[PDB]
């Protein structure tokens, strides 16, 4: 305590903190590139998706809504964007 630099927070404890309580608020979510097991072409998906994302180029269900992060279908791969 006492002499603790609030100007230069450490990255680990900055991620440790709540998203709204950081020096500058940074959301915890991200955008994923989801690849279906059979379809050759990728889809952009929100991590905390609240809707049943359907394959635009097929009938496969890509993710299911949950309390927090959306659950990807088994086999459907994903890569973090940016």
């Amino acid at each position: 305590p006492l002499a603790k630099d609030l100007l230069h927070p450490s990255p680990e404890e900055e991620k440790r903190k709540h998203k709204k309580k950081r020096l500058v608020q940074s959301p915890n979510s991200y955008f994923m590139d989801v690849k279906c097991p059979g379809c050759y072409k990728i889809t952009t998906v929100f991590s905390h998706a609240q809707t049943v994302v359907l394959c635009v180029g097929c009938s496969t269900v890509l993710c299911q809504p949950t309390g927090g992060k959306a659950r990807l279908t088994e086999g459907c791969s994903f890569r973090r964007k940016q």
Partner: protein, 149 residues
Amino acid sequence: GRMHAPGKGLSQSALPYRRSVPTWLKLTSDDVKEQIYKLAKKGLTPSQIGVILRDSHGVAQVRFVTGNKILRILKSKGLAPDLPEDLYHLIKKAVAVRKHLERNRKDKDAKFRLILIESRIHRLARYYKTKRVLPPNWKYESSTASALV
């Protein structure tokens, strides 16, 4: 804290610092606008439009891409709700609780919650009157509440 509940929760979205469109986003402002228009024709409120665009089409903030908010976009072209969506949802909730109450006369929690919902409706309606969104003679009536929704 909550307006009508004792709870004091801290749960909301945290928009990022960067207001620039991400490079991977290949959608143009016009494409986003047409997607918004057809989603509105499907019968969705601006909230649902934003959720669908964020979930499936990979746009973070429509205002961030098109330089303009969703409701303004809908009102600009013409197809916008007669009364604001939050007021509409409040009226719908009040109608539902009233319908439940008229048959369950013994329910006293429902009466209390209904009064809370009416207070919220009145506050919102008075605010919208002061901003000229609603006509000054617009008033909430239980008899015509179901008609409005």
